[model samples]
Target: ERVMFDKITSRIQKLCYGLNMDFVDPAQITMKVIQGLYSGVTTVELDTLAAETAATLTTKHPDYAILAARIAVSNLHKETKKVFSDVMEDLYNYINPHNGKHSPMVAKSTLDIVLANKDRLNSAIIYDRDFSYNYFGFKTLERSYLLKINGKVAERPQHMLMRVSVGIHKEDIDAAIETYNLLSERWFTHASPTLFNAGTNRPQLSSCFLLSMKDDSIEGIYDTLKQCALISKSAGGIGVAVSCIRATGSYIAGTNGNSNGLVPMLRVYNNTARYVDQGPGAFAIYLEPWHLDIFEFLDLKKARDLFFALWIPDLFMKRVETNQDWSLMCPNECPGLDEVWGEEFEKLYASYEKQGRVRKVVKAQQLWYAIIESQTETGTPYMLYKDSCNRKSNQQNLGTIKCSNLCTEIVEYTSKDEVAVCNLASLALNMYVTSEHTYDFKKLAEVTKVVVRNLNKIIDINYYPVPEACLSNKRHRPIGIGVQGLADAFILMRYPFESAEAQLLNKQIFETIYYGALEASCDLAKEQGPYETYEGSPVSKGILQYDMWNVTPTDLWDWKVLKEKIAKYGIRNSLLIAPMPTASTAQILGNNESIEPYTSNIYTRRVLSGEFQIVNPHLLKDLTERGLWHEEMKNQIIACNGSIQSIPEIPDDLKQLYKTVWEISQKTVLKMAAERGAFIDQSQSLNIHIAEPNYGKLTSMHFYGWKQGLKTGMYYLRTR
Candidate 1:
């Protein structure tokens, strides 16, 4: 028994290089690991047990968690091949043992490229980078990413990164190596679909897809339903606009039947999402608030997966502001309200109201209260301003920008002939922080250009699930370059979330991304020409995103020179700079979710491996350096619901630095979002959180964001 315990301890001690031996005791974790062992536990299972045992003590010290991750990833490294080309061959030759048939997971083209440049690709990989991932992040990769053979993970995380890189740049060896380094170094990460399918058979690399309702007929609804299912099956999130569908009791020209309204049809979509949402299946339905079935739309189920968003026109807001009556009309009566915006939409709506075509008239506040009520109940019915989205959009020339995609970060024009799609990637914002505590704007610009170029390349090689998506993507090459670690970046720079320094840094970061993306697009245009429909775009007319928002940019970069170059060569892409909710991908990279502050200092994640507590690395480091991190301190933080503000022992400065979203003022959050809004060419997934929300508070917040000229007022109304 003594020998067994010492054996386990020795192995764990050997792996604990650079870990704080004073705090993280290998013998203690080894004892716990030994108790769970059996008579014939393999070395791999022992390593897993040791890793989890160490991770369970992470709250005591973050270094224990780092040691835990090192053990787990090192075990994986031992199990998998180090050479990239060899792993590619193994995946290419993957066989189904049950059926004894060839079942290659990788695309033939990707395999061919790897084989042709086996030596170069093999030598380019830095396998040591895989250890940089913590345990949870690594587990996320092993679970969803990392190619498998016979239901077991065969590729290491580095191989997966290389596979994705080679898949994106098939014949361009230099580009493939560059992308592999960028991805492997954790500088930026492509979206989940890109990671999941980049080197695979179908290779559908888009993240968010927007589909318009085909028509107001039965056939159109089902056809559009099929499109949603297909996109969802390929692991794409969907946003569907249902504004054009006629309301309940309206005439159906084909069957002369009264419609069952959106509730019944919505249930069908809800079920489709449930059935086909295989992995990361998110479906958000969009509607204008003036629909006759608006109440029913707000009363949909409170499922976290199926989301609801409102495409609110400015006129409805004006009515609510003035306490006037709002007319709810069916699309059959008000034919073109969804097709127009701003003054044009207001004129059409008023004409319908004056002609006695109203289905119902009620106090605008009555409906407003219902929206607030629904939000207070279920934290949803995402708010997006329709007029602001279109009026500020560079895609305004295409048509009225109908709806934003799921998460409300993507605002694009979707017509009957077009289904908007955006390929997404987020830069790791903390990576730009220098050792001297200043951000490297030049490096950020360079990376942004690489992401833009890669996303643009993806559009050409993409496998569109539907023809409309392909046609739309080819015509208007749009991509979203987002960020994941703004809070982390602020912490690295020692700027509190509400500090003026943080605010200025936020604006400058986004400004750099926007400028870098436009510059890269301009360069692409100098070679490949502009997108198919770029003539009348705002950028084509020398009006940048900041120009559209009526704000002036700082003289950080040579915007004048870039604008002149764009004017001369035109630009390849239409829209950029959409910060998506990096819910899952952020976890894989071990960063805070997209541009948001920490929701909690400690996150208790329940994975199939086991449930464990993870402390914020930055907070843990700060407290450890101050000699304040201990078992009692950990329990105290947990007792406070992951808040450090009320802990008497914690310093005020550290408390302020570590305040969660619940503790921070929503006004500051909204103000920061608004400050950065000018540089975001698309929109942002802005979520508002209030401790105990009420009608007045919710109304006040909505009106505030509306007045701020935000395209997406809220993504989800998070409440305690």
Candidate 2:
């Protein structure tokens, strides 16, 4: 053991060869360990400390992350065998600590596949990819996803990728290897829940759950709550709409008592959320603007003194457009608002307002104030236009597209029995930017086609937790193919985020993805035929997504030819491109979420490494080139909360180039989203970010978007 200590020291010291010593001094760290090290400090603990110490200095140099991972990986190799089969066998035969009984972490089917091609599968995995992850990302993977036994990691990054591959492609060894390569290369990644439970006993791999309150009764409410518990217990995120549930205080004919209200019921749900706050498995709630308890609902996520969740909404913009008094009614008193959409529901709601049957009446501006207040205090309760979501949806035939999930990316119909599901993968649009400061439409089209084929494959291979989910997924086969790093794409091409070129490219990217996905789906139709419910679809009638919008797409691609193909064979899926908010995935890939701009040129990130300031690398390079970056400039940006508009030293063009979400007008966000709306088959998750949200501002935004003929009007209301 003493000799091993010297050997470990030698390896760690060797790793410091390229790392800066500002944060990590190897010999100095050894002294700190020596004080606590009596006779024997396990090599694992030493490596962990070394890695953590190196990581702590990330602000000094990004290389420390790589050096830190090197220490951890080297130590792991020293303790464990490098062979994949041996490690997998150990995991497959792990025993549980809680029950002191046998628990198989790896599935039996996966184990058999590995056993049959152990050598090949093992060789296919390139362990070097492990070092590719920065310290924070590697640690995140270790904490949440990597295989562990008795509280110690039993597998590396490569090992986990191999396991996921085999879990998804059990019988086909070649296919499994290919999948492993894709993952290890960082081409795409599955959702968090998928990474956590993919090969476990109950492999519920879905990331988002769309639940509609079953009905306005005790049985239905509790039943939906029970489902939430089950789904959360397994680490699934939720998006629920309680719009159908009777609003606060009307009649409870069953008990002959006046209904209590949304507050008390929400308190119960809030407690459940707190009680079952399993890391990131939190819930996002959705309600229409017309709900009687809408004001109370907005205040729920307020600090009272804590930042728990990011709130967003499915905005009903049309209610504000007509400038009519919004009727807030109890769902029980006025039934069926949740059951219908478009003209039918609008008619029923107007009739309720006329009938003097509402529990509460408010100017649409009054409710708008409540929404803005929530956003100012909580930065949430995002807005998505209700009328827009339903009106533009291909699934418009399938009733109202209710709430979106946690990330506000998915918009689909949820029934008492049917919980809608979507498999999402977004294109890295920035990659298609040309060196000549132009967009490569051809490259965008090609990547989108690949993304389409991949998403369809995911629907078939994805594990559905509920029978209804499986039924819904198979019949409709809706897939979300979004884009990330649009700002990067624009900047790379020397276009400002709001410039005409950027705007045109934004519309063109969606168009290309839609066209490619649709064409690929048609090709799939030629082989396997269209989806089960494709008979009456608008596509079957030769009306493309934009055609449904009563607009014509720019002649970027062969729209005419694609229409002809769809007319002959129909398309395989019902919905194609939904510009989902790629929140988690965007961070992993170093890109902004779907259609979001850089939040700030300079910012702060808090990780296990401690609070560290992060300046946008692109911004830094640009400013550095112009000789405009200095200590004073950095301080100015920090003081302005990452805004450059107030800095006199910064040029106007640079200021325009660096506008964050907060700096940009919420009106422009909605306008741009609507610009690309024609190509989006499924609705987008659009959050209206307002720096100073108030009644008039919120009311104006809702009315503006609704009149734009948009759907999924709002996803979240963001304020600061």
Whole-model lDDT values for every prediction: 0.88, 0.71
Q: Evaluated with TM-score, which candidate comes out highest?
A: 1
- Candidate 1's C-alpha runs over 4 A off are 1-7, 36-39, 253-256, 302-305
Clashes of each: 0, 31
Instruction: Estimate the lDDT of model 2.
Output: 0.71
Q: Name the 10 consecutive residues with the lowest summed lDDT in model 2.
A: 303-312
What does the lDDT come to for candidate 1? 0.88
Q: Candidate 2 on 616-637: residue-level lDDT in tens?
A: 6567656766767677788888
Give the residue spans of candidate 2 off by over 4 A.
1-80, 247-249, 276-281, 295-323, 352-361, 431-454, 461-463, 623-633, 644-656
